[PDB]
Amino acid sequence: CCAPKPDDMSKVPYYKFPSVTKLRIRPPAHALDEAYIAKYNLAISRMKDLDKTQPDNPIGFKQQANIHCAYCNGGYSIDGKVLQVHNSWLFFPFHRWYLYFYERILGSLIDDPTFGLPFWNWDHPKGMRFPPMFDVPGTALYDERRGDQIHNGNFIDLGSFGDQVETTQLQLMTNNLTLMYRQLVTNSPCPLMFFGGPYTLGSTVEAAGTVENIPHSPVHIWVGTRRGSVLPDGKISNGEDMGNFYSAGLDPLFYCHHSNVDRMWNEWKATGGKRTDLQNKDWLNSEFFFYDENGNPFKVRVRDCLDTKKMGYDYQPTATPWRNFKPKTKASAGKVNTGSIPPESQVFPLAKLDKAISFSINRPASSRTQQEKNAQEEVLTFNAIKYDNRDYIRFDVFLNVDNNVNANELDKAEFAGSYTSLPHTATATLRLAITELLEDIGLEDEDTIAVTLVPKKGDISIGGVEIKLAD
């Protein structure tokens, strides 16, 4: 994490886009033509060469990896404030700018002014396998520090928590696309839920948005080696490369994953409405620091990365079949007797979520008008999720079911969302937008509903649970 930086950010100029905007198309990583794979490998190979020939050059492979490591570790400050780009509303714009310069570097090393950084299309069934171009040993895209959950033609598990898949292939694909639907539609109806919130003061509660939680974290977990296992070099793994935030940038696939995370921002806004960029001036005027492809230092602003076409790139149009994955069936017919389960006040603070537990919770308002629903989002909020930051964590949330719910079947109207964590006491919050579920299950006139938590991995405590109306 020895990242290069100017000591005095006040002397660093602000970036200016080139006067001639040369539009790059980022293509899906699967089924890429061999000629594109060849030049991607050449660019990465030349980037890695700089590790040896020019180890201090900021555009080299290891140094670009160090930039991400140092950002995740708090090693960059501008205007006297540390730049917090994880578990915060800076997550998307930081990575957009990071990849913008990374893509310009790749193109510059092969004299290709329109080189497009491919995206791992893990939201589409054709892209849910590990992308073949990255699994050719002896090429620059390859990384031996990956798990072997990724081969055999296995589909990615977008809710992975480091263990093997436990369902059928059909159900795993179904769960993946249901998670996409929940994370890109249901649970991100509004900007702060998609992007996350300010993670400024402490207030050390993590404030990730939807995508940063899921599917972003499970991809890291699925690709990286298994912590504790023997690496191909002989040493014990801490999740290297992708499974550890110190080393993730050392895997070329890291950038291709983030290309799709960046694409999610575009796809989320594509339906308009309330899914727009954050309008808060504090967010828009937040700054980051980067080196351009000529090794020159610059500051950039969030407000200047909102439109990728203005930055000179866009994504190859690609179907998003998860938009059709609103569950059609209910796991449980009828309505749960909320008098036969403990109220939230009796369960929380919950010292350990060791097994499935159900409880009743009060809604602040019932029979809400459509104008009310437009104005304020109904959000089920899990406060003070606490765990060891060295642990893998996952739990799922269902409405209107009981402790016997089959949590391997996410394609149900009752499935609300999930929380996961990638090992860095942590403290976190989970917010779920429940209006769509209350409508589908027929609970809109209820003052009290049943909630069921199902732990899947890790030792988890939860301080409290409340339903609030958020603007």
Nearest to 450 by CA among 394, 405, 383, 393: 405
Q: Which listed residue (91, 134, 155, 220) is catalytic?
A: 220
**To what resolution in angstroms was this structure determined?**
1.8
Residue 236's alpha-carbon distances to 145, 150, 226, 227, in angstroms, are: 11, 19, 9, 7
Among the listed residues 115, 130, 134, 216, the single catalytic one is 216
In angstroms, the CA 455 to CA 459 distance is 9
Q: Which residues pair with 81 in a beta bridge?
A: 78
Q: Which technique?
A: X-ray
Q: Which helix (H) or strand (E) holds 173?
A: helix 169-181
Q: Is 257 assigned a catalytic role? A: no
Whether 258 sits among the annotated catalytic residues: the reply is: yes
Shortest CA distance to 320 belongs to which of 125, 155, 170, 158?
A: 125
Distances, alpha carbon 200 to alpha carbons 89, 298, 389, 448, in Å:
10, 23, 20, 35
Which token pair is 212?
A: 């940063």
CB 66 within 8 Å of CB 51: no
Beta pairing, strands 313-315 & 24-26: parallel
Q: How far is CA 375 from CA 89, 190, 203, 378, 450, in A?
A: 21, 11, 27, 10, 25
User: Are residues 85 and 73 in contact, defined by beta-carbon separation less than 8 angstroms?
Assistant: no
In one-letter notation, the amino acid at residue 220 is: H
What is the CATH number that goes with domain 9-324? 1.10.1280.10
The single residue of 119, 194, 245, 288 carrying the catalytic annotation is 245
Q: Is 86 a catalytic residue?
A: yes
Would you call 398 a catalytic residue per the annotation? no
**b/e map 25-62, b = 16+ CB within 10 Å:** ebbbbbeeeeeebebbbbbbebbeebeeeeeebbbbbb
Residue 114's contacts (CB-CB under 8 Å, 6 or more residues apart) are: 22, 23, 24, 25, 107
* Angle (nearest 5°) at CA 105 between 320 and 22: 65
